[PDB]
Amino acid sequence: APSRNGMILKPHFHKDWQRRVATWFNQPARKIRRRKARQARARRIAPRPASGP
Amino acid sequence: AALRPLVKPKIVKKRTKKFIRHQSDRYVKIKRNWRKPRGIDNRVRRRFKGQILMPNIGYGSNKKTKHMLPSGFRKFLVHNVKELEVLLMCNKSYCAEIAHNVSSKNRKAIVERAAQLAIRVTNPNARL
Amino acid sequence: GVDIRHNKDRKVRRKEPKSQDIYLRLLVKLYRFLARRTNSTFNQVVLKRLFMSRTNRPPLSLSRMIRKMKLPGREGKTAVVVGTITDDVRVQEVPKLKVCALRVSSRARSRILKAGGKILTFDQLALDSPKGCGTVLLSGPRKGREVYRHFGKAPGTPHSHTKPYVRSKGRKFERARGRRASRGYKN
Amino acid sequence: PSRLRKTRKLRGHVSHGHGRIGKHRKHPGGRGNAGGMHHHRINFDKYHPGYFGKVGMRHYHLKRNQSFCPTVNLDKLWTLVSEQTRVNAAKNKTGAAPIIDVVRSGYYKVLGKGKLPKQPVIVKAKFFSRRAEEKIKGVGGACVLVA
RNA sequence: AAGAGGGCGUGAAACCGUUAAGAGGUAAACGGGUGGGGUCCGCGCAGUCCGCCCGGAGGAUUCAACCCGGCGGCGCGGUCC
RNA sequence: UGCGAGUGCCUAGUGGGCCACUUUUGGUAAGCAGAACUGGCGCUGCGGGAUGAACCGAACGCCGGGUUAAGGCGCCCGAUG
RNA sequence: GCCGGCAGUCGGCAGAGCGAGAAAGAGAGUGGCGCGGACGCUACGCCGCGACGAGUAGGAGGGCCGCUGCGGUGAGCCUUGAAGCCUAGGGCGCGGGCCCGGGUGGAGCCGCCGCAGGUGCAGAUCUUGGUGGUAGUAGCAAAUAUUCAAACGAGAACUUUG
Structure with a gap:
């Protein structure tokens, strides 16, 4: 029921989106997981560059 | 004699009886605390004659006679000795008042300190 | 009883600024005293304009200040603005200026000082001209916001040029039945 | 901050700020943009003209990379x-005419909006406007294309 | 500490038992206004002090003005270094 | 003759009404149905009409004195005892 | 609502005013003894006039109204007694509610500045749990029937024996 000059909005919430909500509380832990594996990758190849070829 | 206030005006109050909530006499679950009647057909809300009175702004006391005791002082809560010296410039129109949580061991020390600074205490002998 | 319409009894003008900052209130404190003591009506407008909201005192472009200060008569004259001074990139030459404002952007500040100008604050304005003598009061475009293009007469009304509220501009989202002579009607 | 919400001031009022005759039901008008043509037609006509119907041709696989054309005035x-660069111009008795590469900064078409200060230039752009040229040629510059 | 006694940290209200007081034929209850009777409070019951001056009765190792030392404020010292 | 005026945004609730002086449609008539202006109840307490939607007066912050409107002044019940 | 007033507490570095019918200064110049003066101004404060004060649905503003937890803060309170509960005690605020006195209680709790919410009940034939009037009332009535003496026991219409 639109009233007095809003945009015609089309929210894509008609599916059961609450079962498939992806939270991003893993972001700081994933950054540590990627970083601690990045340092460990660079220590196995001691003289080689960390970025690769 | 005691510690008299600096000025003693005639304290007048427009209404001294408490404001009673509607139908609190009939029921027990309705407390004495006032609630505004917001019904569609209520005798209290539209001010029918011979009913209870609703609290309005006109029942407010004069700004000069507000918040004094019958003795003529304003209350101020006191916890310890350190908060007693702040009233050293207000002892002629303000009284010290001791909290319920003050132990009897240091309650006596506040009372005799208030005598030295000539500050009235409304509860000088509470715990003894 | 008295038959008085009480719906317009309370005026809706501003009394105190809604900001909780202390530098603006000190400037309000300074100009509160000058408004009710001095006979200068300039200080009353500044005090009135120091109560406005952020969307109410629009930024003043630098080139509009140059355009409005090159008028004949106002030479050796200071310009006082209540909003903010912002740089304009489409102006090349800038003369010597004397500008007073609450805030000047860093790019516009270095441009005025390079040309030998002078940027003052409103506390130094009271020390220079407490009555505001020899001052020019300017302001930015009040209707220059994008918000005001959605106001006025409603769209879908003949001889109305209001921007509609559209999520994104495309060929098939609008300009159809209601806008085309081929599709139903147009206004 | 729920303590500044309107709901805290509505504690006590029976209707909770939503009417006594017409109660706040579930969906009186219909869910979403229900009834574009029926019973909500006036709101769609006098506030969103041209909402209904087709217009123009359909381009199926439209890529924004082909139609990329940023403009600068x-x-x-x-x-x-x-x-x-510009203070080292109209000087040295040469007519230095510095080259401004429009594509280098990230613009493609050059438009003629605005007033150009009197200094001949060389502009390198993929596209140009007719009114763009006569301002540069009127000043005394020259336009050079690039791909 | 059982005024913590085996579903036992405190033990509210509805309800009930008993004691003290009061009242009772227009169901009970309520608002305004008083009056009477109670339980406690003002630890009241010869009634508040605060400054200046006057009188006579008493006491200090004391007042003003000077000397030394220290600290602080101000200085358009027209314009000290 | 009196009054400080203009203007821009959002925006709840409402979209079952009723009554009365006057005009008036259908109906024998209706506390019936349906229209116009204005005022009320709705949303509003108060004095009066014994009682009370819309009747008369009059609209309301809490009080003291004085004076009234409409109504009244044998008693209930204030006032022609 | 007032173009409201108050930065002027400008003090031997002084002269204490701008309520007063009339557009503007208690303005600068140059020739003819005794050390003295009440309050104040959280300028989101203080003070002065005038008008007004109803209210459903509804909207806005102020809460030094209230609950829970968090960051600071009170050299905060507390086994010489915290929370909770009761109170014919004393009170405050128009009001939301709040502060003390007494009693029980024994271990944590409160004020201010901001933050956050699962934050305030009289109803919803609301949910759970408890308790009343009814009320010592309806009732303990379908199928013919019990009586006498003794025993056990503290106790027998109902048990056992004859």
């Missing part, structure tokens, strides 16, 4: 280069 032209 002549009024904001000397900001593309540094300040010391």
Whole structure:
């Protein structure tokens, strides 16, 4: 029921989106997981560059 | 004699009886605390004659006679000795008042300190 | 009883600024005293304009200040603005200026000082001209916001040029039945 | 901050700020943009004209990379280069005419909006406007294309 | 500490038992206004002090003005270094 | 003759009404149905009409004195005892 | 609502005013003894006039109204007694509610500045749990029937024996 000059909005919430909500509380832990594996990758190849070829 | 206030005006109050909530006499679950009647057909809300009175702004006391005791002082809560010296410039129109949580061991020390600074205490002998 | 319409009894003008900052209130404190003591009506407008909201005192472009200060008569004259001074990139030459404002952007500040100008604050304005003598009061475009293009007469009304509220501009989202002579009607 | 919400001031009022005759039911008008043509037609006519119907042709696989064409006007032209470029102009008895590469900064078409200060230039852009040329040629510059 | 006694940290209200007081034929209850009777409070019951001056009765190792030392404020010292 | 005026945004609730002086449609008539202006109840307490939607007066912050409107002044019940 | 007033507490570095019918200064110049003066101004404060004060649905503003937890803060309170509960005690605020006195209680709790919410009940034939009037009332009535003496026991219409 639109009233007095809003945009015609089309929210894509008609599916059961609450079962498939992806939270991003893993972001700081994933950054540590990627970083601690990045340092460990660079220590196995001691003289080689960390970025690769 | 005691510690008299600096000025003693005639304290007048427009209404001294408490404001009673509607139908609190009939029921027990309705407390004495006032609630505004917001019904569609209520005798209290539209001010029918011979009913209870609703609290309005006109029942407010004069700004000069507000918040004094019958003795003529304003209350101020006191916890310890350190908060007693702040009233050293207000002892002629303000009284010290001791909290319920003050132990009897240091309650006596506040009372005799208030005598030295000539500050009235409304509860000088509470715990003894 | 008295038959008085009480719906317009309370005026809706501003009394105190809604900001909780202390530098603006000190400037309000300074100009509160000058408004009710001095006979200068300039200080009353500044005090009135120091109560406005952020969307109410629009930024003043630098080139509009140059355009409005090159008028004949106002030479050796200071310009006082209540909003903010912002740089304009489409102006090349800038003369010597004397500008007073609450805030000047860093790019516009270095441009005025390079040309030998002078940027003052409103506390130094009271020390220079407490009555505001020899001052020019300017302001930015009040209707220059994008918000005001959605106001006025409603769209879908003949001889109305209001921007509609559209999520994104495309060929098939609008300009159809209601806008085309081929599709139903147009206004 | 729920303590500044309107709901805290509505504690006690029976209707909770939503009417006594017409109660706040579930969906009186219909869910979403229900009834574009029926019973909500006036709101769609006098606030969103041209909402209904087809217009134009359909381009199926439309890629924004082909239609990329950012524009820059002549009024904001000397900001593309540094300040010391333009002060080292109209000087040295040569007519230095510095080259401003529009494609280098990230613009393609050059438009003629604004007033150009009197200094001949060389502009390198993929596209140009007719009114763009006569301002540069009127000043005394020249336009050079690039791909 | 059982005024913590085996579903036992405190033990509210509805309800009930008993004691003290009061009242009772227009169901009970309520608002305004008083009056009477109670339980406690003002630890009241010869009634508040605060400054200046006057009188006579008493006491200090004391007042003003000077000397030394220290600290602080101000200085358009027209314009000290 | 009196009054400080203009203007821009959002925006709840409402979209079952009723009564009365006057005009008036259908109906024998209706506390019936349906229209116009204005005022009320709705949303509003108060004095009066014994009682009370819309009747008369009059609209309301809490009080003291004085004076009234409409109504009244044998008693209930204030006032022609 | 007032173009409201108050930065002027400008003090031997002084002269204490701008309520007063009339557009503007208690303005600068140059020739003819005794050390003295009440309050104040959280300028989101203080003070002065005038008008007004109803209210459903509804909207806005102020809460030094209230609950829970968090960051600071009170050299905060507390086994010489915290929370909770009761109170014919004393009170405050128009009001939301709040502060003390007494009693029980024994271990944590409160004020201010901001933050956050699962934050305030009289109803919803609301949910759970408890308790009343009814009320010592309806009732303990379908199928013919019990009586006498003794025993056990503290106790027998109902058990056992004859």
